[PDB]
Amino acid sequence: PNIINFDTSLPTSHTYLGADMEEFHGRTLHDDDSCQVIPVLPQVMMILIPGQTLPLQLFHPQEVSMVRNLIQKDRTFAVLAYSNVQEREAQFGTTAEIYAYREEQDFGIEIVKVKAIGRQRFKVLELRTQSDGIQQAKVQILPECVLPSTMSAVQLESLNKCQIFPCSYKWWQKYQKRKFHCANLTSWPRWLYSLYDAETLMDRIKKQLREWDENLKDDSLPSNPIDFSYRVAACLPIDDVLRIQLLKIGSAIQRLRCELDIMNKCTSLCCKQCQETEITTKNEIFSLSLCGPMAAYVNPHGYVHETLTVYKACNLNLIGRPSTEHSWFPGYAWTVAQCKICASHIGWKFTATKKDMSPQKFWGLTRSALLPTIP
Amino acid sequence: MSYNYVVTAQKPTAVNGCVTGHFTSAEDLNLLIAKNTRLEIYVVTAEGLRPVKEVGMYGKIAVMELFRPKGESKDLLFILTAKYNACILEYKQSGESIDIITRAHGNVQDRIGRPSETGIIGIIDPECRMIGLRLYDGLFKVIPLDRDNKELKAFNIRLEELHVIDVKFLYGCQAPTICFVYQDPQGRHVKTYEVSLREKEFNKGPWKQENVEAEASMVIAVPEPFGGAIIIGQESITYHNGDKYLAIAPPIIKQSTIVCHNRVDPNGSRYLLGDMEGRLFMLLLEKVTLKDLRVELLGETSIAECLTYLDNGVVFVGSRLGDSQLVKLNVDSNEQGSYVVAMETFTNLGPIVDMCVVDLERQGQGQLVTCSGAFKEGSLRIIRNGKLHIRTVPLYESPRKICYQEVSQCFGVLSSRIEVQDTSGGTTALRPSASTQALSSSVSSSKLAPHETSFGEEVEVHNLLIIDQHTFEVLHAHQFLQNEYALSLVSCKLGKDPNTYFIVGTAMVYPEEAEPKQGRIVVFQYSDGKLQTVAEKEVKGAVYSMVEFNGKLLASINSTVRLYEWTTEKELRTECNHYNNIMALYLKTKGDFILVGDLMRSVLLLAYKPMEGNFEEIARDFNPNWMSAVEILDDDNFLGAENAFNLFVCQKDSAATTDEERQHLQEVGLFHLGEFVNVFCHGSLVMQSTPTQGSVLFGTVNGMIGLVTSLSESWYNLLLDMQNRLNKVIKSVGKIEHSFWRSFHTERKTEPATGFIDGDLIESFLDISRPKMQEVVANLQYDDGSGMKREATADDLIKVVEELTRIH
Amino acid sequence: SMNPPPPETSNPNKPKRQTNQLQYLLRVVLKTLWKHQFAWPFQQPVDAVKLNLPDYYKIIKTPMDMGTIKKRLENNYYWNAQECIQDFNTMFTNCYIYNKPGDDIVLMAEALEKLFLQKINELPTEE
Ligand SMILES: [Zn+2]
Incomplete structure (x- = not known):
């Protein structure tokens, strides 16, 4: 725990990707249910979530050519969500809009580093590999199911003038009693419709997030339920099938409900290979980055790891000396961490360089090697 | 592939609006009442009311106002539907053939726009220069009232005030002017805008923006010679008119928030006000300009949805929660201190929250027993056909569930009343209801809270009422535990036990625990005029539903569906479970088929395997929409009601073709009903070579009752x-x-x-x-x-x- | 099978001299290829036991890595620049032989070889 003087903005900039990139201020958004023909990247094996920052390093000449093509066009590519990762099956996915690129010369081979951001969910209609080797995808955009307030269907026309509202636990009971009055007309009570109210679910998630992220809910967290649900899903350390199940959800109410179910149920994080080897707990999770405790980063090899930052970890051997080369958190040296039983790569132990920093040491675990566990 | 047939057996009786004007003749006084999808016109006489016409529209009447532009002989009627169908109608009578003609009609639904939280707000300028519609946030639609506008074309104006509470056209102005109340990060304010027909824009009003009460809600346009606007909230009734600023704060209105109003005198001297609990106050204005405001308590009416002053002191009270009323206002109060005397009462079945069918009098002749109303207007309703004879048993507390037990000749009814924190310590009721006036009443015994109570806040108390079927006396009123909410109720015999029991499911609800993690299943027996607790079983969640399942008990507990056997020791023994992705709210059965339903239209059809001793998933459908009630029609059809007053029917395929497609429920039937269905149940009200197969009645919120058959x-x-x-x-x-x-x-x-x-x-x-x-x-x-x-x-x-x- | 010993970096019987070409190869070529981000698979000999490649040293008869070249430059083992250039090219060829053309490591090796050959044309002559 302790306190922090690190400045949580540097992790989101991905300063390790060379100098200042060519940032773009535009944005392209397709229509709902509209079909598009989008190119897919071959080496990307991540399940992308809207709003999630995605850095990438591509050196293959085919990849660099496709990157140039996209830079000259609408700057949008498709990231597949693989259900079976080995056979290249894809039923769902998320698009990503490139917002920074950097091709580097005075370098061995021609390489390009790109910062993109997930945009819109989609269903995979057709996958066809071209003669080039790169594969295109005919794709249908999936819309956001924004359902209205459940009381609007049973609202009394006399009470229409009461539906606007000018120690925190009494204000929420006042809210529940005033907004869901007409619930007496149905077969269900007010507290039941309080479980399907996006604002109450958002407040409960804000409560569970003030444990990890010390930033206030004033400016950091969005106010829209869909943006809030996606931001929460971006930093939920779960395994791949759970992330796919969460991505299938259309109604943001159901998304927030499932996220609260996960946050209340799963408490321990174990090794995905061991299944019975506790690595850490939900308590030790803290946010070193603005986007949350768990964000996507890229290594020199070009692989993408979703690093979750925790204060303490258990049952981890440390391999090798610390190193500062290509460190995702400047001012910290990483050290490879393996499971104490199966020796699988769990993450890295980041120790501070300067002795006046805080925290002096923390852990960054990759999501793909973790497994949620309830007692 | 559905092949269904839905009919209205009882029209909606709930009142959602009433006005008074001169619609049929310039000399006649007309009272117009809106019952959702019905329009009732009456003529006011010295006796009471004379029914002249009742018409049925193809839409839910959201706005209903009368007006007369300079040039006509009598008033015209502006009507807007929930689907944004607007029209202006006239009354036409020739001998005995009456026909409501359409002067103008049209759709006003925008292409884009988020519907507002305050809903549809429609107002008319006094001099009949325009109609102002408030449908979406930050958009004010204007329909000019020229003689050439028969399409009802309109134009939108931009609102810098996004969160508007209420708005009214002010009297006594050269240009049409609107006065509204809005909110912003600073607080709640009131403002005025002049609408321009030449520029199609807004102009600065006659008086600037003032800061008002934090809960300022209602706006009343005061006619000449006064003018200005009255702003009513929870604690103050203020008045603004140019330089005139007058604020009062009578303590008699602090107990309940005022919701509706109506004008008594044409010049704007007296006004009627109705609050939530059902009280009716009088707001008097003292005279060229205003001198002072005064609020007196007239008396207790039904929980008013709307009010209108007829003549000679007669007032009509339209109530959706309770019966419609015609009352008298005397000059001198009576003995108890109330200026109100009831003249006549019209039945109101809304809101129906549960019901059942019984062979009370004759055998075969079905009769419908329903829970209706809420708070002091709650009641049981016994309906039989002879249009429809309806007996009423008042309860003065809110009923929630009901079921019939034949061997005991009585009904079991779950009920809820409101109490307030005692000055010392404990609770005290507001009125004596059915649970506090029973021939016998018991409380249950605990078998298992920090930051206790507050300063006189409301709390719900739940009871189970055993009520005789011949006399309808509240025979027993068993009160449940503190902070315990009763949800389901079933009368059934289980296993090899000949005794018939009343089974109740309850959840331990607390303020801090949003999701109830604690609940009970209780089994009572009734005989010889006393209720004893036979069986108790603790569960780790809310018991949302219970069903008699071939002699066993099928109970839902949050995200779990469990089966209980009835042992020889008279206990509840678990046989099998099933853990779903959703929380099981709705539970139904037929044979071995079981239907599970979530609030967001998530449907799951399961099957009990008798040789395996477990449940198996047959089919499932996920389509997000707010539900309200479900029902199994036959082996393959499943009926349900969802958001926007709609019915739907899903189907399965037993044989089918592919393993993947056998687990899907197609969306085969769709229909727009116009009513929020709250309960489905099998039954028929007719004496038992017929084109129809099956019969399922359903009850609604607006008092409407319908029948569905394949x-x-x-x-x-x-x-x-x-x-x-x-x-x-x-x-x-x-x-x-x-x-x-x-x-x-x-x-x-x-x-x-x-x-x-x-x-x-x-x-x-x-x-x-x-x-x-x-x-x-x-x-x-x-x-x-x-x-x-x-x-x-x-x-x-x-x-x-x-x-x-x-x-x- | 198991690992072989690394190539010897020091030899007291071998003479020690610091020519212009070798000090250039140490201070420029090796330094440039060292701080390159694609250098991580070549900064040490191939640990065939960990990577589970039993057939690497069966195919690669002459191993070589940039760490061995660095330890040979620091200990003055090199007599002329031709031996250091041959060591670099032998490392590149060993990387090319074992893997398939089109793998990630092959493209990284091609990158490093291109940078080495574009830094090797600027060869100063002996003082
Ligand atoms: Zn492990």
Whole structure:
């Protein structure tokens, strides 16, 4: 725990990707249910979530050519969500809009580093590999199911003038009693419709997030339920099938409900290979980055790891000396961490360089090697 | 693939609006009442009311106002529907043939726009210069009232104030001016804007923006010679008019928030006000300009949805929660200190929250026992056909569930009342209700809270009432534990036990725990005039539903469905479980098939395997929409009601073709009802060679009751063609398309009504004239029952419709 | 099977001299290829036991890595620049032989070889 003087903005900039990139201020958004023909990247094996920052390093000449093509066009590519990762099956996915690129010369081979951001969910209609080797995808955009307030269907026309509202636990009971009055007309009570109210679910998630992220809910967290649900899903350390199940959800109410179910149920994080080897707990999770405790980063090899930052970890051997080369958190040296039983790569132990920093040491675990566990 | 038939057995009796004007004649005084999808016109006489006309529109009346532009002889009626169908109608009478004509009609639904939280707000300028509509946030629609505007064309104006509470057209102005109340990060304010028809824009009002009460809600436009606006909230009734600023704060209104109002004197000297609990206050204005405001307590009426002053001191009170009232206002109070005397009472069945069917009097003659009303207007309603005889048993507390037990000749009814924190310590009621005036009342014994109580806040207390079937006395009133909410109720015999029991499911609800993690299942027996607790079982969640399942107890507990056996030691023993992705709110059964339903339309059909001793998933469907009630029609059909007053029917395929497609429930039936269905239940009200198979009644929020039954393919096709031919010949009130009315309409998508026959349209065939009958039957020959094509005359379809009317 | 010993970096019987070409190869070529981000698979000999490649040293008869070249430059083992250039090219060829053309490591090796050959044309002559 302790306190922090690190400045949580540097992790989101991905300063390790060379100098200042060519940032773009535009944005392209397709229509709902509209079909598009989008190119897919071959080496990307991540399940992308809207709003999630995605850095990438591509050196293959085919990849660099496709990157140039996209830079000259609408700057949008498709990231597949693989259900079976080995056979290249894809039923769902998320698009990503490139917002920074950097091709580097005075370098061995021609390489390009790109910062993109997930945009819109989609269903995979057709996958066809071209003669080039790169594969295109005919794709249908999936819309956001924004359902209205459940009381609007049973609202009394006399009470229409009461539906606007000018120690925190009494204000929420006042809210529940005033907004869901007409619930007496149905077969269900007010507290039941309080479980399907996006604002109450958002407040409960804000409560569970003030444990990890010390930033206030004033400016950091969005106010829209869909943006809030996606931001929460971006930093939920779960395994791949759970992330796919969460991505299938259309109604943001159901998304927030499932996220609260996960946050209340799963408490321990174990090794995905061991299944019975506790690595850490939900308590030790803290946010070193603005986007949350768990964000996507890229290594020199070009692989993408979703690093979750925790204060303490258990049952981890440390391999090798610390190193500062290509460190995702400047001012910290990483050290490879393996499971104490199966020796699988769990993450890295980041120790501070300067002795006046805080925290002096923390852990960054990759999501793909973790497994949620309830007692 | 659905082949269903829905009919209205009882029209909606709930009142959602009432006005007074001169609609039929310039000398007659007319009272217009809106019952959702019904319009009732009356003439005010010295005795009371004289029924002149009742019409049925193809839309839920959201706004209803009378007005008279300079040039006409009598008033016209502006009407808006929930689907944004606007129209202006006139009354026309020639001898005995009355027909409501359509002066102007049109759709005003925007292409883009988020519907506002305050809903549809429609106002009319006094001098009849324009109509202002407030539908979406930050957009004020204006419909000019010139003689050439028969399309009802309109234009939008931009609002810098996004969160508008209420708005009124002010009297006594050269230009049409609106005065509204809004909110911003600073607080709540009131402001005025002048609407320009030349520039189609806003101009600075006559008086600037003032800061007002934090809970300022209602706005009242005061007519001449006064002018200005009155702002009413929870603690203050203020008045603004240019330089005039007058604020009062009487403590008599602090107990309950005022909701509706009406004008008494045309010049604006006296006003009636109704609050939530049902009280009626009088707001007096003292005179060229205002001198002071005064608020007196007139007395206790029904929980008013709307109010209107007739004449000679007679006032009509339209109540959706309770019965409609006509009351008298005396000059001198009576003995208890109340200026109110009830003149007449009209029945109101809304809101129906549960019901059942019993063979009370005759055997075979079904009768419907329903829970209706809420708070002091709650009651039981016994309905039988003779239009429909309805007996009322008042309860003065809110009923929630009900079931019938034959061997005991009585009913079990879950009920809830409101109490307040005692000055010392404990609770005290507001009125003596059924649970506090029973011949015997008990409390249960605990078998298992920090930051206790507050300063006089409301709390709900739940009871189980055993009520005789002959006398309807509250025989017993068993009170449940503190902070315990009763949800389900079933009367059944279980296992090899000959005793019949009342089983209740309850949840331990706390403020801090949003999701209840604690609940009970209790089993009572009633005999010899006393209730004893036979069995108790603790569970780790809310018992949302319970069902009699072939002699066992099928109970839902949050995200779990469990089966209980009845042991020889009279206990509840778990046999098997099933852990779902959703929380099981709705539970139904037929044979071994089990239906599970979530609030967001998540449906799951399971099957009990008797040789395995476990549950198995048969099918499931996930489509997000707010539900309200579910029902199993037959082995393959499943009916349900969802958001925007819509019904739907899903189907499964037993044989089917592929392992993947066998686990899907197709969306085969869709229909727009106009009513929020709260309860489905099998039964029929007619004495038991019939085209229909099955019978499921359903109760609604606005007091409407309906019946659904399946059909055959040929009969469905014939009735659909009949519906088309009848739409092409019948003149609609307001000129609204029937298919547009019955179209499954949400704000996200709109599709036509498939797999459903609107029984009201098929019934209206008998009302029209014989030439129109010959019009409809002309060139029919859609009979596909024999195998070829059989013709159809007028008498054939007359007899067909008569037999279709002989099912309710 | 198991690992072989690394190539010897020091040899007291071998002479020690610091020519212009070798000090250039140490201070420029090796330094440039060292701080390159694609250098991580070549900064040490191939640990065939960990990577589970039993057939690497069966195919690669002459191993070589950039760490061995660095330890040979620091200990003055090199007599002329031709031996250091041959060591670099032998490392590149050993990387090319074992893997398939089109793998990630092959493209990284091609990158490093291109940078080495573009830094090797600027060869200063002996003082
Ligand atoms: Zn492990």
